[PDB]
């Protein structure tokens, strides 16, 4: 079944029927540009009832000389490049002005309007340095930590947020604030780890598709979006800038001492790698669209630069694991008994994967070798592998995750990377790896990252985000990239020499 | 010695002692202050004669308010993240504005001054949107062809050049134009080839380190970099944007019929993989530095994606290969004699790498499937050793090159995709491709270019650039890398079942 969701990971955050009400969301028939949905905050923002708007066509509302460029663009298929649209809305005789942000999703033409006149606004000059020098900084970064600290310093400067951090996910979707720029007010989260549940699975998948979100104030009544009959099905809002956010995450931000936020998905190889997260500890922050997408852009630049700087690499060992491998291959090549030819290679075989223990099961007939004992316990380990898959190279940093019968062993302090030699799948190779104990600095108590109501099943976020030092056992140090090719390569060589052996009969 | 350099790889293009006169090059003593070199075109660009500039501090000519922010910047360690410098030059009592491009090379601090236009909100927004729309368009590129396509369209859109092409180097450092954006006006260079003497080694070694060069006009007068007594030794100008370029290359551009030029290096795996190259056919192109580097950054993103996007080339052919593989790995299951399992789907094994012939030598006997060399195919079956396989897949379209006897049968196998199955190297799988006449469109006879003066001992580039077809003989259609890959995966699949068979008997 693979994975494996929980109570958070089920909420449907993409169709709440409601938008954040500092702006107005509409959807327009194509090609009529007739309004089928409007949001009930329309009189507060545009000066019209919802009633008035529905079934009416957009051109009726717009000051007559900007009808042509707006309508032309709304039917353009190159629209995502055209945001923001200049929107002048005329009631009676007087004008108001909006950032129009149009998009299409699941066959709907959605248009959101952000009041753009009486504005926060940012001077062009710091908008100019943030994207021009921003670009220059990320390009000149010498390592990942310069890349990160350039991003947050630049986002903070351009937004004037109280806090801005780089948040990096891990293989289990825990996260960790690995860089930060802040005003002295806000408490520093630099160093903290957060549970994978602060950004649950449906959120995470959304932010892989939509890369930009802002909550300008966490205190608002949602504006319901009306529609006229024939469109009662809840409208998809994945890509709506104004979508109402999961109110329990509003609760979360409350307990985190933060009154506004903005985040930006960071992407590597197509999956979510981390966030740019920004916080205002007190005060709303209604950041104009233009400033946001400049922030999104520094995001997309930093993402694309990950590999070319996160690849500070490890430019040896690889070469020598290649050289260790050559050695093990040449020795196996030469004994008629190559299982005993690899077990005579205790140090070359342990050091290939940086394992501190190994075991070889073949025609019977286990031969342990390193220091990871089990032996009585290991016969249950090995053809537990024999059951439902251990193909190709099995690899884990916490064997007590997949086979918690290891909890009682030395644990994944006797740490496993394995495979089978023949696909008749009963000849195995194991590797074992000692513990890394590691103190880990958590925000609040991960044990209890979620609270429950009265007497009530509804969930709530933790009230405490203060440093809480867990110590972690089971886990050892990560199996690096180069360690699992080395394992498949040695698998490839066992297969070759076995095949050569039998060609010799 | 490797290369082996005809009559061009001498001319130290890095020390010409002259620049392109649309800008002014300066050299600055350090710590701070005082001008040791300066180009003679100062008065025409800048106001002052070099005689007045030389020996004096930079401040003396900088408008006083601008003076300290700028000399704080010229003292930074990483000037790169500050370019362009805002240089406000006060002459008489009028302020002329320049882009200050600063760097250090060989303990010498070099300030080039290019005339600047003062930025303004609206045209910056459109530029920023273009760079940002270019950046994502490359990330969303399906394959190399598309990556190349988006790149040339995006560079042209920013620079307004008449032609932007992707020039791709092959193995002898010849070239090919593999994609092009252009004003249909200009004659289309798409598909042409250009000999490696057009970009000599010390040019490419230069461009391996400096990824951006522009010649805003070919017809121009090298303003010489004059200096102070005690500084008269050649100035290393390898990283200067104004460094006057080798004058034989300007006649090349003249002869080629190009008035202005811009090129950007492309880097795969540390080595020069190609250029982005741009021309103006008549008229000039003084591209501002901000736009120039934004093009360079798209080049850096393109470099960063070459492997990934090329790895997804022919992404239907791959589907079709993988299901042919799948098909072959099953029909080898119902037969203990896997060899004839591959001889039933001889049409499948032949379509797997698009060959018209194949051969399996297994346990001393050879099975022939398509059109093959004569039954003396003991031919290249015995002959081999150094390279040859060793392992894994041997792949050529010039089998007459390495293995000369095949000239007799290039009508049926001028190309050879082959591997061995075991370390004993008695068993092989061979695929054949016939000769294909093939014609290669050069850019005027590439036998010349290695050209002399009167013929006095001077060098000179070709005169005609008309399509000059070469009819290459003795090759098959080139072997695609998804085909080489398909042979790799079959080869180890054949191993896996070669074991499993013998292994259990
Ligand atoms: C199971 C319920 C939840 C618990 C318990 C919890 O803690 N979060 C739950 C659900 C939830 N979270 C979000 C959105 C979200 N969460 C974060 C988390 C962090 N912000 C930070 O700054 C840090 C560390 C520095 C962490 C960790 C973030 C950034 C976001 C995105 C919104 C934002 O920027 O504030 C959602 C979805 C909200 C939505 O998209 O509607 C849910 C359901
Ligand atoms: C023996 C000397 C030379 C012969 C013969 C010749 O043909 N060129 C010689 C010297 C030379 N060229 C350059 C720089 C250079 N050349 C090119 C070539 C091309 N531009 C195109 O668009 C195409 C085809 C599509 C080709 C081929 C390019 C791109 C460059 C880079 C400069 C530019 O973009 O205009 C040099 C070095 C000059 C210098 O860097 O100072 C030399 C010595």
Numbering used by the authors:
A (entry chain B), B (entry chain A): 11 to 515
Q: What do the authors of the reporting publication say about this deposited model?
A:
In order to understand the role of the unusual Thr289 in signal transduction in SaBphP1, we replaced it with a His so that the T289H variant SaBphP1 resembles classical BphPs. The mutant PCM also crystallizes in the dark in the Pr state in P3221 with three subunits denoted A, B and C in the asymmetric unit, but the PCM-wt crystallized in space group C2 with a single, dimeric BphP molecule in the asymmetric unit. In the mutant PCM crystals, subunits A and B form a non-crystallographic dimer, and the third subunit, C, is related to its mate through a crystallographic twofold symmetry. Interestingly, the crystallization conditions for the PCM wild-type and T289H mutant are the same, yet they crystallize in different space groups. This already suggests that the mutation affects the relative domain orientation. Indeed, the r.m.s.d. between the T289H mutant and wild-type PCM is ∼3 Å overall. As shown in Fig. 5(b) and Table 2, the PAS and GAF domains superimpose well, but the PHY domains occupy different positions. It demonstrates how tightly the PHY domain is coupled to the structural state of the BV chromophore and its immediate environment, a coupling that is essential to a signaling protein.
Phytochromes are red-light photoreceptors found in various plants and microorganisms. S. aurantiaca contains two previously uncharacterized bacteriophytochromes (BphPs) denoted SaBphP1 and SaBphP2, which may be responsible for the light-stimulated growth of multicellular fruiting bodies. The classical BphPs switch between a red absorbing state denoted Pr (λmax ≃ 700 nm) and a far-red absorbing state denoted Pfr (λmax ≃ 750 nm).
